[PDB]
Amino acid sequence: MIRTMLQGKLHRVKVTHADLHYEGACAIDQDFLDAAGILENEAIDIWNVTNGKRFSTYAIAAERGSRIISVNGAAAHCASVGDIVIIASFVTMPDEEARTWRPNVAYFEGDNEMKRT
């Protein structure tokens, strides 16, 4: 049987933009997406450390190096600029592969600077 496992997450990144109109999804610096192994158009869950809200949407790429985290469309009701959020994707696999599965985790410092190790 098949497990759902954490694929990767952006841990405690800060929302940089929030615009109800127009567009939607959560636009994320492509460098951040690569670090966490998250793909453009992949389903993502967003857990807001600042306000406690939890919601699910999908990832789109923002410009590499922009350090952008933009919550757009209806999702803009769920976060504000400055909020600290955790952004996660999940994947499925057989139990055997799940047992030794390792998520990609990206950590942050300062103004959404990616932290090493």
Residue nearer to a second copy on the CB measure, 54 or 63: 54
Nearest 10 degrees: Cα torsion 74, 75, 80, 86:
180
- Report angle CA 13, 17, 20 to the nearest 5 degrees: 125
Closest distance between a second copy and the C-beta of residue 89, in Å?
8
93 belongs to the binding site for a second copy (CB under 8 A): yes
The Cα 21–Cα 35 span in angstroms is 28
Which of positions 51-90 make contact with a second copy (CB under 8 A)?
51-58, 73-75, 77-78, 85-86, 88-90
Pick the closest to residue 28 from 10, 11, 53 (CA basis).
10
Contacts to a second copy by CB under 8 A: 1-7, 9, 11-12, 20-22, 24, 39, 41-43, 45, 47-49, 51-58, 73-75, 77-78, 85-86, 88-93, 95, 97-99, 101-103
